[PDB]
Structures are given as C-alpha cells and as structure tokens.
Write a protein that binds this ligand. Structure first.
Ligand SMILES: CCCCCCCCCCCCC/C=C/[C@H](O)[C@H](N)CO
Ligand SMILES: CCCCCCCCCCCCC/C=C/[C@H](O)[C@H](N)CO
Lengths: 97, 48, 297, 245, 245, 297, 49, 245
C-alpha cells in the first residue's frame, strides 16, 4: 500500500502536502459526493503517486484486481458512514448516490 | 466515487472537519506484461 | 442447496462446447475408389439441396464411372504457416534531407499492416489471426545505394513516450528495445511476439472503443481496435548533426506460428484507407472479367 | 422428418412445416464461458428463461426491386425486453443466438434469399464515390437498431467484399419454391470471453435476395420477411447503472 | 465478536462496527419455492447476483420532533435497477429481504429507534376525524415508493394498532448509545407461493423513534437515517411486456 | 451440463427452509429448579440487551433464590382451537314486513366476519388464518318469539347467480347447498370447509386486486381481498305470499381446525367499517387507562 | 494503522466466480525488468574543441 | 490482546495500552553476524545489557503547522551512554534497533503520523532553488544528532522522493483516534557485515504528520512526540582511542 493522491487539486509548493488526503465534514445528509477518481493505475492522475502506478508506468499491459484502503484520521468521538462505489466501465460518472 | 452514506456526526468539543487518507495497492492476481519505456523522463538538460 | 428440480436438472454451467465435427489427419488428397454403373431407384446422390446451406457431398464415384487412383499429392503447402510465412512489404519510412514529411532526421511509423494491398488482402481473409512476427528492415538511399550511416530502430509500445526529435530524451532506450545497425550491414531482423491484449488480432472490429456520442469530430473512432494498436516504430539517424545521405526504409513482415479464425469473403475492391473498409462508391467494379455473351466463351 | 421442425426456448415456441434443416454456426453449439477462459472475477448473472426466448423484432417487405437488408447483433436486442435491460445494466456480454428468418409465399411465387451470418461485419462508406473523401458511416448506419438497414450496393455488401463468397459464412437459402424459413444457430464469436453489448457488435445478419422475387399480376403482392431470434446461453457481468447507448 | 459484522451479497458489501446481532424474521432464512409448493408451470427465472444486492434507496433526517416513517416492500424496489426491471417484466414475485437501517451518531447523542417489519401493513385513513367518512388512503400513501411516508399518528401506526405491541414482529432497536445499525432478515411472508410485485406489498418496514432525539446545542444537528436492503433468493415468473405500475 | 464452478457449487435450487428453531412439546408450565446465592464476576444473567430485538432469557433461578416447584398447570386452554372454537355473532339479517331494507322477504348477506368487534378483534390478531367453519342460524321475531315459519338458507358461492326476489329462479338450488328449517326447530347448524383459493385467509391485504389507475371511483378496491370473498348468504321466507311474521336472523360462527400465522398488534381503536382499518382520527384514545401522576397509583 | 497491507481478497468482499489465472509473472522479475541495454554515458572526441 | 504491549530489554521497560502491533523490518529479527559473513579477524565485543536498552533521546512538539522531523541512526546514539562510548572507542559497528515513537492525545484530538524507516536516507539540498547551484547539506543537517531535523519539503522528503511511496519501507501509523505509539524493529541494513558508527548512517527514521493535528480551542495544545529506541544484538570491533566525530 502507498498513499493515493485522490485530492490532487493543489499545485503550489506550500500546499503540495495536502494532496495526500481529502477532507470530510458534517453535511446535510442528502448523500452528497465527496471524491471521485479513475481506477486506472498507469494512467495520469491520482494513481501516479502510488508505487503500484509508478511501476505499472513501466508496463504496457496489466491484469488483476486492485485494492484501495481509506484511513480515517478524524477524532475518536466522531462517527459516520460513507458509501464507496466502483462503477464498471461503460457507465458515466454517477449523478447521485 | 465516495458518497456520504448518512452523515459525519461529531459531538460538541471535537473538530468539525476530518481528513481521510487513501492507500492503494494490487491484489495477488495482479500481473503485468510488455515491459515498456517510462512515460516520464526526470531530466531537462544534461545531468551535470 | 439445490432442492428444486428445475435447478437440480438444469444444464446451466455446462461449459463444454458441443462440437459436431472433429479434425481428422489428411496428409494427402483423398484417394479415388473404383466405381461401376449404378441403376437404382429411390436413392440418388446427384440431387442435393444447397438450400440447407451445406456444401454438396456428392463424390466422383457416385456420379461417373471412375478408376482407382492413389492420390499422393501433399496438402502441406496450403497450411496457414505455409501460406502466410512469407515476408512482404508492410510499411515504408522516408528520411529525406530537405522535405516536408520528415526533415528532422526521424520518423514515427504507427505499426499497421493495412498500408499495402498485397499483405492486406491475405491477412484480411480471416477475421481473427494469432501469430508471431518477424520484421526485417531494408534501408537504402533513393538510388538504391548503401551508405555508411548508423541507424536506430526503437520499438515504442502503446503508452511509452513517442520521440519528438532526433536528440529527444526518449532515445535513451533504457527500457524500450532498440536495434543499432548500419546500412552496410545486412538488414536488421527481429522476432516480435503476439502482444495483443485480446487472444487474437482482429482486422475487422464492428464497434466503437469508448462510450458516448459519436459525432463528426468523434467519428474516426469507428473500426479502430485498440487491441491491434501494437505501438509505434521510431527510427532516427544516430547523430547530433543532420545526416549526409537521404534514406528510405522498407519494413518487411513475415508471420509465423499463425492461427486463424472466421474466414470471410476476400476483398474485391480497391483499398482506399488504412484500417477502413471504404471503397470507391462510383467505381464499383466486378470481381472477375466480363464477356460479351453468356452462350459464347 | 427434416421439413417439419419446432424450436422451443424460454417461454416461446416457433414452428415450421417447410423447414430446410438447421445450420449450427461453425459446427459449435452455444455454451457458457469456461472457468479457464473467463477473465472477470465477479460472478456473472445467468437469467436463463427471461432472456433466452424468441424475439420477433420487425417485418420487412420483399419487393421485386429490393436490394437487401442487414441487422447487427446484439444491437437489435439492446432495447428489447429483459434481455435489453440486462445488456444495459451489465458491462460484459456473452451469448449465442438462434436466428429464424420467416418468408412465406405460395407455390406460384419465385425468388431466393441468401441468409448469412458475417461476424464483425464492418460497414464502410462509399468514400464520396471517387474514393478521395475519408467518410465514415453514421451512427444510424453502423448501429441501425431493430429496423435493420437496407444495403446500398449488395454486390460489395457496402464493405468491399463480394456477396458471391458470402456463403463461406454460416448461411441458409430461402428459395420460395421449397422452404419458407432459415434457421441458423450462432455461438459466441469474439476474440474475448466477454465484451460490451452496446459498443461492440459481434456479428451481422444479412438477408439479400439473390434471385429477384417474381409473380404474375393478381397474386399476393406483399411478401413480408420477418426476423425471429433467441439468445442462447446468455451471460452478463459488471453491473452498474443503466446505459442507454 | 457480535458488535462487528459484515454483510456481503451480490456485488455489494455492507460493514458495521457497532452492530447489535442479526434478526432472522420468524427464525426462517429465505429459500427458493419448493416444487411441492409451486403452482405456476413455467420455469421461473433466478437472476441471482444481478438482483440480490444491497440497494441504498433514500436518506431520512431524524429530528427531535420526528414522528416516524414507513416503507412498503417490494414497492421500494419496483423502480430500482435490474430488480425493478425484472419485477416489471414478470407477473409473479418471490424473494426474501435483508434490511439494514443505518443511523449513526456520537457518544453525546441520545435517542431510540424501533425498526420493525410488519407483514401486510394495511394503511388506514383518519376517516375524516370523527369517523363518519369512509375515506381511503391515496395511491401515494398506500404505495409511497422509495421515499417512504411519514406517519401521522405513530401511536396507532395510522392503522388503529398500538405501536407498544409492534415488538411482536421481527424488530431491532437503534439506541444511539450502543448501536448505530439494525439488521433484519425477512423471508417471503405470504399466503401464496408467488404474488404480483406491483399490486401486492408483502410487508412494510417501520422506523419510529420511540425516545426523542436529543443533544446539546453545538453538536451535529443533522442525524440521517439511511435504509439499505438486499433481496434474497429472488424468483420471477410470468414474463410479458413491462408494466410501470 | 454444469462445468463452471459458480454453477456446480451454486446453492440455487436449495428449497429447504433453514429453521433456527424447532417446536418442542410443553404440556405444562416449566418447572422451577432450586437456586442459591451466586456471587461471581464476569458472568451476568441480569444485564440483557433488548437492543437486539430478542426477549430477555433471564430466568427466576438466575435472579433470586428460588425453591423447587413442580408446575403442573396445563397449557391446553391457550391453544388456537381452545381460544377460537367458541361460537360468536358474526352477522345479523333483518326480514321486516314493512321496511326499506328488505321488504321483499329475502336478504343477501355477503359473508364477512368483520361486522362485529368481539369476533373481529380475536380474528385480527393474526395476519393469516386457516380453519374450518361451523355456522349456526338463530332466527326469531323481534320480540324473541318463535313462530311457525319455514325458511331457506342458501349458500351462494362467488360467481353463482344472486337471487333478486323471493320467487327468483335461483332458489331452485339445483346445485347450491340449501337448508330448510322452521323457527320452531332448533337452530340450523352446518359445517363449512376452508374454501379460500389461497392457502390461508388473510384479514389484511396490503395491495390492490387489479391493475390500472386507482382513481376516486376505483378507490374502494384497496384492502379488499378476493381470496376472502367466500360468497353470499341468501335467506328467504319459503312462500309465494308475504310472511305473516317479522323475522331477525343471527348467524353465529365457530372456527375449528384453526391454524394461524404472523401475529400482529391487537386493535386498540374503535372499528368503523367492514374490511377497513380506518379509525377515528380526532378521537384516538390511549390503549389503557390513565392516572394523574407516575409516582402514585 | 499497523503498517501492513490489507489482506482482504476478492472472495471476501463480493460474489466472485471461479477464474483459473494463467497469466505469467515472469516478465516482472528483476532480470526481465533490468536486463535491457540503455544509455549510461557519452564520450565526445572532437577535432577542434 | 493486540492493543496492550510491553517491551523489555536491558534494564529498561516500555509499556503501552493503545498499541497497534509490532512491525519487524523486512520480516527479519536482529541477529549477530555469522562467522561466514564476518570479515574482521578480531573478536568483537558484545556488551549486551549495557547497550541494548531503551534510550529516550528527545521530545518534539507536534503543532497544527508542523512539517515533520527525521533522525539518523546510529547518529542519535553516537553521544549517548555506554552505547555511545562503545561506538566512539570501536571502529566497526553492527546492531539492530527497536524504535518506539510515543505520541499521546485525547479522544477529541485528531491527526495522523507516518513513522517510517528509510535505509540510507541521503539528504539533498534545494540546489539554490533553481537547481543551477551544486550545494551540499551542512554537517548539522546530514548528521543532525539527537535533536533530529525538521524537514523543509516533506513532500519530497528533502531528497526528491515522494512521501506517498514512503510506505514501501517498514512503517506504522500513529492515528490519534486509535493508537498513541508506533513500534518498528529494524535489523542491520547494510551491504557490509560491519561499518563505522560515526561516518555511516545505516538508516533514517522519518516522522511526518500526513493529516494535520486539529482540536477545538480549550483542549491541551501541547502534543509532544517522544522517540524511544533500543539497539538490538549490538556488536563492536576495532578498538582504539575514542573519536568524538
Ligand atoms: C522492432 C519492433 C517491431 C514491432 C512489431 C509489432 C507488430 C505487431 C503485429 C501486429 C501489428 C498490428 C497489425 C494491424 C492491425 C489492424 O489491422 C490495424 N490496427 C487496424 O486498426
Ligand atoms: C351456509 C353457508 C355458509 C357459508 C360460510 C362461508 C364462510 C367462510 C369463512 C371465511 C369467510 C370470510 C371472512 C372474512 C374475510 C375478510 O376479513 C373479509 N373478506 C375482508 O375483506
């Protein structure tokens, strides 16, 4: 496992460190969207920060299931439930939960 | 895609915003084929 | 578990492909057995029905009085490897000194064997082909003269950085396979494996590679198979300055270990575009020659 | 014993009294994907009777000047019934087919239809006639849907391939003098164990009248051609939200 | 060993770290219809993984003054995914269910939810208050859909039955101090081996807060209640054209 | 056949209903065993979790020091047949001389046991009930006097022609079962089987009987179960002329061979309509009595 | 948190079929990855320089 | 059974009640040099309990804007106790390590530390920003001592290597919500059986907060990070007069 730059929006040097993690907060409870990213490891994007993606950049063809683990860094008293969904190829970005 | 199932519930006296760290890896059936050149060349001029 | 009859007796999951036919060895052509005059009723080999869609199985013995001929004519030369394992031109690379095509001393050739009808008509006979490849690169000046020039042939798989100049950093070939030969040397010859993600190359792909609306700008994506995009071929003159000689490079491909599936009708119209079955609409010509009348030769 | 036949699958039954035997495409019955050939890890869904049934999709009128028609598979069923719903909800696709073309006439009508199945039937354009224009067929022509599409130049099948050699593919002849139906059973023909049921068309069915229809004035002038087909051993995988095209 | 649980079915997985065990409705797991109980002669379709998966249908906000909500089954899924498509295309229906209600709060929140499954939960009207008016609930109230419906008089459950005796039905308690999820597995409950998935609602799920939600000002005021459910051993029969309602 | 693992090992078709519980005989109440003072840590029977949704299983012995009591109290009278096999009023038929309800000397009573709360509250305790029926018809004048009048009770199954007059042709009862008794005779008593098309009567049907739009005119169809429409009861005074005496007929039903499923909360509001769970919205009363304060009795 | 990669498999998360994976892992070995000649140094031998 | 742990070595004992298991660097326990791997002929000294003990070297304060810190081994102990005396008097060095990072907070604090061990962690300079200046890090930065050193650009770890791939090295996470300690056991990592304990730094320990520390105003604002470590199977060889640097 290596840190996946899901929140790869920033570009300035003083905030390059916040690309490693993305935030969650109290919401309105309507099943809003938190983050999206493509599942291609050797494609330009979040997966370039991973050692898996860097190595797959050296190989044209890959085959096998990938695994993504999200670590919650909130306080011990903070709870909540999140839905993480993988959309197989062919379907566009889901409009809602 | 990551969606809020219910909400992020926090009591009084704890931070209202929390961060999530995503770690990515491959399973045991992952294989690679057709070794190719690197897509990025970490070099601008001659390495002096 | 399974307690209902429709599940217990279900044939779901039977992955064996019931094949009504089995391959039988046939080293030589079939022998002809003795036949005699046959005058009987009810049974008739001559009358068949092409209506069914099966080729008529009437033999020589069942139609005319035949002798006994031991046919020893071998069928080896009509096999797939015998038919296809002959090198033929598939691509040509021009490296001019002053020109508009490749004046930079390098040229990127997208690997595709559809650029020449001689090879294309043969390969296009089958829908799916699985084979190895052997590529030979014959390089010479436009006058056919050999010159002491050192070249580099680079195999650039899909996704690898395409060189943009003769001194580009991509030529360091730290991972890509490269061949360094001189024109005075015999033509460079390498063996290329079956690199398609699919189990077999498909020359015709009746579909689109990506979802979405296929408008006018996104209309060239029809018939393009990413499973056949084996990569790019990059060639350059090994040097910092411009080469002294103009070069033209011809690439000959020879398939081996060939396997083929799904025969289709052979092309009968002039080819117009790479990876495109387009034909001249107003210039549709008949497959064969014509004659003035049907009752005369 | 060979002219009368009855095909039953799912909850639909098709009968015929002037059949001309049954052609199994390339001598291979449709079968489920073996575990040594499958590449997707998710368990595929096999709805069985809800999708493996005879669908009567459209009726085309055969005329004395008709050029021919072709249909794309499984495009014709991408928008039909539970099969279409499953094909829309699932990314992967695998099935065989059993195509039954109906074309019935009287003993005083004449004509011959060539019903063939051409895998990966890529349609080309006329390239502006002269051939200097790099055109591509529109979406409505490459994926005609359940209405099929009428061939412009049936001699080259709109793809630069002569129809005289089309019989190398699994085919049957509907010659009105003897038979009024053609039955072709086509297994899954692809280089992949599974493929998208929307983007990729595994094969195209061609119905081209080689001998023109003829009859004396007074007989029934409307001779319809009806296509009936039933997927066999259909599998689906990679479920997500429905995708319309 | 009893507080952490993971439910996986189809291609969906639901986890929980503060579970309170699992209730099997009437001590009976969902099962396919036996051949001695089936009455339809056609072979039913069993799509399996394409329909037996966890559907997250809607999210309701729990408030200090909430009265309660109820959902009707399989009405909530009559218009959702491949399951809804099969229920529309097929006349007959048979399945179990696995209802997972999510309601998570902090250790400083308090409140108790009663999550119960009441078979044949017939909704009655207020009869014009006095009871002299023979009213019937509207279609939007008898078949609320995926949005559920808010109870008007949760004490009588809008049906003249006290909620104090609702615990006789399969039920679980979501008391925010201990557990944040309730899991109920409900087999097929009907007097018939099969029934219409559109006209008949086998059971209704009730989520009524018995102890009002409370928290000091400053804590997270939005406490959502999310219903997640997965049909089990789903069967369908009597295929025809799709019917929307 | 089955060759793929996901089909061979599939549990599809397992029609056995895994039951976590099994019925055990219990002729009498459970005995109480000797218990002593118990002072231990870690193990605690008193603390339970109603959160799970299961009734607490703590026993007397695990809470207080108990003696040994051999409980011989029989549980026979709480069984379904003991509780339900008691005849009670389910319908009343009025046959007046001059009136607006039934002045024709006959009356058709649609068979339904929801017309009287005494019976309705008992039967409505369970969602599904399967039983036989025994109907007794007590007929008398409004003054309670018995008169020499001959009556005919006809069972009219759903679909049979409903009589429209005292001399209608439907009274020929050539197929329908009929009972001819006099008021001086003991009340007529017959046994009725389980005639529902379903495997069990359902008092609550959360659905509609037919497809289509359920508008205002087609709104009474909610909650009506055709599988409970057992038919109509037709009674008439056997004669051509009008009867001399006014009659009121009370029908008492007594279930037997009762089986019940799916218990539900018992009704706690006044009933308003037959086959309708409607309740007085403004007059919702508490299930039990109230008291001034919680700290006092 | 422990610092070990999660060992959850496909079978333990979603309903999977039986796939006999015959994809070779030979090309990702050290010699396969590294035994490809690449430029490491360049020497210039000018006439006037 | 996995959250409580006690590490005892030498005459020092370290306990923990919110541990997160123990990471053995590269799955290999520290061990003495085998006679087939040793190259020096003199008999090495193995002081055992006098050097194999937990040293608490320094305490760093974690702040909401901290960038991270790193320590070099065995530089941190080159000037500490009997271990430092032996490292100064002996030319050769060989030992493993057991690094225990302490960072304790309350249940209302949040933040995540990445504690990793990177062998041969060579520190580079910023090369004057543009990269045209061939600078080298000073002695106080390449060998920071027991005070460690604060990273300037933790994203590249001041060495041009992304921290996102740092987890490939033996590492643990100190996420204040669950655990307050990270234990890493590192064997001897070098291309030589012995090496100088002064000139060569076998590995560098990195403590970089990936998720910033946060807490509402009023809680304890001082959250210290304390490094405790114990050499394992320490050997020394090549005795001469003491050398200070
Ligand atoms: C020195 C390196 C040479 C590498 C040679 C790789 C050749 C691979 C053999 C097959 C190449 C694809 C041939 C063309 C396929 C299809 O017809 C076209 N892509 C149509 O789109
Ligand atoms: C002399 C002939 C008498 C025939 C007696 C037939 C009685 C059959 C027993 C069950 C009758 C149905 C009772 C009512 C059922 C439901 O509650 C209502 N139909 C509600 O719609």
């Amino acid at each position: 496992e290596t840190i996946l730059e899901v929140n790869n929006v920033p570009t300035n040097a003083t905030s390059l460190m916040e690309r490693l993690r993305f935030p969650v907060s109290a919401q309105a409870g309507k099943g809003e969207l938190c983050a999206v990213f493509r599942a291609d490891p050797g494609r330009s994007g979040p997966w370039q920060s991973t050692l898996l993606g860097q190595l797959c950049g050296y190989y044209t063809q890959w085959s096998g299931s990938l695994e993504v683990t999200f670590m919650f860094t909130g306080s011990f008293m903070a709870t909540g439930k999140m839905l993480i969904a993988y959309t197989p190829p062919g379907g566009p970005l889901p409009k809602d939960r | 895609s990551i969606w809020y199932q219910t909400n992020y519930v926090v009591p009084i006296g704890a931070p209202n915003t929390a961060y999530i760290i995503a770690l990515a890896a491959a399973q045991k059936n992952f294989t690679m084929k057709l070794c190719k050149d690197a897509s990025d060349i970490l070099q601008t001029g001659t390495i002096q | 578990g399974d307690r209902v009859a429709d599940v217990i007796e279900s044939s779901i999951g039977d992955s064996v492909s019931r094949a009504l036919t089995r391959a039988l060895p046939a080293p030589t052509g079939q022998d002809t057995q003795v036949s005699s005059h046959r005058l009987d009723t009810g049974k008739v080999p001559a009358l068949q029905a092409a209506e069914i869609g099966a080729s008529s199985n009437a033999s020589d013995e069942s139609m005319i009085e035949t002798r006994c001929v031991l046919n020893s004519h071998s069928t080896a030369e009509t096999t797939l490897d015998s038919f296809f394992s002959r090198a033929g031109l598939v691509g040509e690379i021009d490296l001019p000194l002053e020109g508009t095509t490749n004046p930079n001393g390098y040229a990127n050739w997208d690997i595709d064997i559809t650029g020449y009808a001689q090879m294309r008509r043969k390969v296009e006979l089958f829908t799916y082909m699985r084979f190895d490849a052997e590529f030979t690169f014959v390089a010479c000046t436009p006058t056919g003269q050999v010159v002491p020039q050192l070249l580099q042939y680079m195999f650039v798989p899909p996704g690898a950085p395409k060189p943009d100049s003769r001194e580009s950093l991509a030529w360091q070939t730290a991972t890509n396979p490269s061949v360094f030969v001189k024109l005075s040397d015999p033509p460079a010859q390498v063996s290329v494996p079956f690199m398609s993600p699919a189990s077999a190359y498909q020359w015709f792909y009746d579909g689109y590679p990506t979802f979405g609306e296929h408008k006018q700008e996104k209309d060239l994506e029809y018939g393009a198979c990413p499973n056949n995009m084996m990569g790019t071929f990059s060639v350059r003159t090994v040097g910092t300055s411009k080469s002294k000689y103009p070069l033209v490079i011809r690439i000959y491909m020879r398939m081996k270990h060939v396997r083929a599936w799904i025969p289709r009708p052979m092309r009968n119209q002039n080819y117009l575009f790479k990876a495109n079955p387009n034909y001249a609409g107003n210039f549709i010509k008949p497959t064969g020659a014509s004659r003035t009348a049907i009752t005369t030769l | 014993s060979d002219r009368v036949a009855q095909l039953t699958i799912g909850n639909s039954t098709i009968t015929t009294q002037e059949a001309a035997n049954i052609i199994v495409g390339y001598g291979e019955w449709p079968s489920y994907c073996s575990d040594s050939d499958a590449t997707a890890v998710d368990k595929p869904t096999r709805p069985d009777v809800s999708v493996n049934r005879f669908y009567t999709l459209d009726t085309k009128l055969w005329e004395k000047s008709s050029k021919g028609w072709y249909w794309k598979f499984p495009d014709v069923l991408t928008e039909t019934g539970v099969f279409g719903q499953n094909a829309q909800f699932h990314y992967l696709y695998r099935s065989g087919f059993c195509i039954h073309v109906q074309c019935n006439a009287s003993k005083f009508h004449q004509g011959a239809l060539l019903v063939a199945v051409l895998p990966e039937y890529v349609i080309g354009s006329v390239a502006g006639g002269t051939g200097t224009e790099d055109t591509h067929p529109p979406y409505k022509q490459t994926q005609p849907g359940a209405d099929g599409f009428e061939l412009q130049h049936p001699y080259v099948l709109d793809a630069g391939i002569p129809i005289s050699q089309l019989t190398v593919c699994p085919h049957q002849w509907i010659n009105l003098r003897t038979n009024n139906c053609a039955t072709i059973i086509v297994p899954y023909i692809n280089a992949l164990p599974f493929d998208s049921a929307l983007n990729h068309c595994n094969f195209g069915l061609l119905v081209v009248p080689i001998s023109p229809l003829d009859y004396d004035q007074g007989a029934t002038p409307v001779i319809p051609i009806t296509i009936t087909l039933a997927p066999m051993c259909s599998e689906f995988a990679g479920l997500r939200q429905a995708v319309t095209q």
